[PDB]
Amino acid sequence: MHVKKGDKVMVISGKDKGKQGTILAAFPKKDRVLVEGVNMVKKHSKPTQANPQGGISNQEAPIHVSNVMPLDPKTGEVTRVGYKVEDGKKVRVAKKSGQVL
Amino acid sequence: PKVALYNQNGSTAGDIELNASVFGIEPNESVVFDAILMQRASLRQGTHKVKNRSEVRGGGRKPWRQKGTGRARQGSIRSPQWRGGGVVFGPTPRSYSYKLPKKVRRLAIKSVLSSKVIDNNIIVLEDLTLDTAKTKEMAAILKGLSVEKKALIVTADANEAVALSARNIPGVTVVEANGINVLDVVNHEKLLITKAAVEKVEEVL
Amino acid sequence: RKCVITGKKTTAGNNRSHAMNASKRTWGANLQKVRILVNGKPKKVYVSARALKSGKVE
């Protein structure tokens, strides 16, 4: 899973293009990532435990990792992900630059 | 046969008049039919198998009486009319190959080679040597030969500069002169030889 | 308890006669113990019997 929770994720395709944002949650066993803004469905809820207002709730649905790419911290550009070692721990390395994270 | 010749760069150089014993026979189109169905046959492993009435894990009992009752005869719970079923005949493991006589397979190669002399999809390229195994150099050669389709290269003794290259190119496969594949010469439809392999063809036929 | 010509000796099998309380008892070498030459070389040890015509003539 080449993307860390809390990055600057850019959405490739799907029902919404264009929008970028941050990860709110992840599901690596199911290969799905919950990102703010995108894939927001209007969900029905019954007036049950955890605030029985019922109504139509509003939240986002998780997106598969293949729509997710991080942007360049040097240019603001959708770049691919490599790997280097800088004094100890392996770090993520964005392509098209010598950038990290 | 007066087949032309080019350079590794692709520039026009001195040609080679080939040998009529190998490249100047008439095309024997009846042999080429029965040539390829030999080689196509022994590319199939044919390892298909179906459990018969015996290898069926059951069967056995007369499932009820034979008289006194109402049904048909129906004499084992796994006969072929039944739903669980042993297939009646089915396919069994076997081979498909058969070794044609040597005078056929000599003539079968030569008629294809003599055809491509007429078909002009054949270019002798001496000394195909490369620094790296990079297919970008290989792609530059092919567009320098105006080949936008399938192609074949006959090396002398499987030069690894050619051999490690071009396995990534879809339409081009690499083969040496010891491995002149009767399907692939017909299949790839355009053909390249090194000059050392030209006599290596001629020394065996 | 043997010889060298057919496979039947002091071994392990069956019998069911009566009066009926039971375990292991014997088939032994059926001796009556004297010379031969089918091998004429002596110690005068055991014999058993499946058939005894044409052992020899004399």
Binding site: - | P27, S30, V32, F33, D34, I36, S115, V186, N187 | -
Partner: protein
């Protein structure tokens, strides 16, 4: 021959005379094997040379066979394959093998006498027919007996 246009010589391929599919083609119901015979059932039937109970032909004839161990298949030369050679050459059974004259030396090379020669030859071999001994001398050739 292109892969798009594969075709045989007409007469070298021939479709199946496949048996038992519909009455339209024929061979439908009975499947070529008639009405209710013993020669129609599942493999039951007859040996090849069997006559229904009448004494079959291989027994009512006597036995006139006897085979010795010590037989010799002599190599058979019609004396005319030596006309493939020129005169004055060597004629040995080791030479007749690799020249394609005799494909198998079965312990003995006898030379028959049908035909004629015109070539003086150094002929040595195991046995000779009587007319072949004179026919080699008729061409002046020598008739050594190995």
């Amino acid at each position: 021959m292109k892969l798009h246009e594969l075709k045989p010589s007409e007469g070298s391929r021939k479709t199946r005379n496949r048996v038992g599919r519909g009455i339209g083609s024929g061979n439908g119901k009975t499947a070529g094997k008639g009405h209710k015979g013993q020669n129609a059932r599942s493999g039951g039937g007859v040996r090849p040379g069997f006559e229904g109970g009448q004494m079959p032909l291989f027994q009512r004839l006597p036995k006139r066979g006897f085979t010795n161990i010590n037989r010799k298949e002599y190599a058979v030369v019609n004396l005319d394959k030596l006309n493939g050679f020129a005169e004055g050459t060597e004629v040995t059974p080791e030479l007749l093998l690799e020249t394609g004259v005799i494909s198998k030396l079965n312990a003995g090379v006898k030379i028959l006498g049908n035909g004629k020669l015109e070539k003086k030859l150094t002929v040595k071999a195991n046995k000779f027919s009587a007319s072949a001994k004179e026919a080699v001398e008729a061409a002046g050739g020598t008739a050594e007996v190995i």
